[PDB]
């Protein structure tokens, strides 16, 4: 994940890895 473009679901993977069970948002 480090020093990578995060396109599509890759961003969702990254947000889960950072926010865990707190949830996260990325749209709209």
């Amino acid at each position, epitope marked *: *994940f480090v020093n990578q473009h995060l396109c*599509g*679901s890759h961003l969702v*993977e990254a947000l889960y890895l950072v926010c865990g069970e707190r949830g996260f948002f990325y749209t709209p």
Partner: antibody
Amino acid sequence: EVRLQQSGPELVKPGASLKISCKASGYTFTDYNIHWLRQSHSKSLEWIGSIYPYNGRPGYNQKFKNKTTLTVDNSSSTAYMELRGLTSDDSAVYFCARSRSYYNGSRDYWGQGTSLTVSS
Amino acid sequence: QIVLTQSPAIMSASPGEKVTMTCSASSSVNYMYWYQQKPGSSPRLLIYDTSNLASGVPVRFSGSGSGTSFSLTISRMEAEDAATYFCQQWSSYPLTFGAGTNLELKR
């Protein structure tokens, strides 16, 4: 060539524990999540969880959290899933997998699966 | 939590026919995956992020959809496409799959 190699078929008794391994090669192990999935039959796929091999930080499906523990051994490029309190309901094939490569990947990678039979 | 419902659970086609399989989500999904699986084989990725063609899969396949309704299409069925097809949302966690759509051959 990316490959994920899983441990062999397993048969255990109810209540026992089991650690299934997933061996990775062909890429920087530390850069990608390893995902774990269970296939109870030909019409069911479930995501168990994911682990970040850089530091071992895992994310669990709450349904499997109580009885599943994910670890990693970066020096051996291997991921492990531990199952506890096993019952016949846990009989299934278990898959590890890795997402498509970042930026412009078009191919993900799956292990061959490990068959688990929970019976006395 | 996001429940995916694939219909028809069972459908038949002969080579040359157009096949459309649907995946209905219980809530908004931003990225939908699609996998193919035959007995004795690992799930094979076909579509990533809703409409992108996975590597090594033929151009007769196509993914589409938005919000709560998604589709996988085979412009012209070939016999070797007999298999079960799964949708998987990669929008919110936990990741969930549909129960699959069995595509069998007509006779």
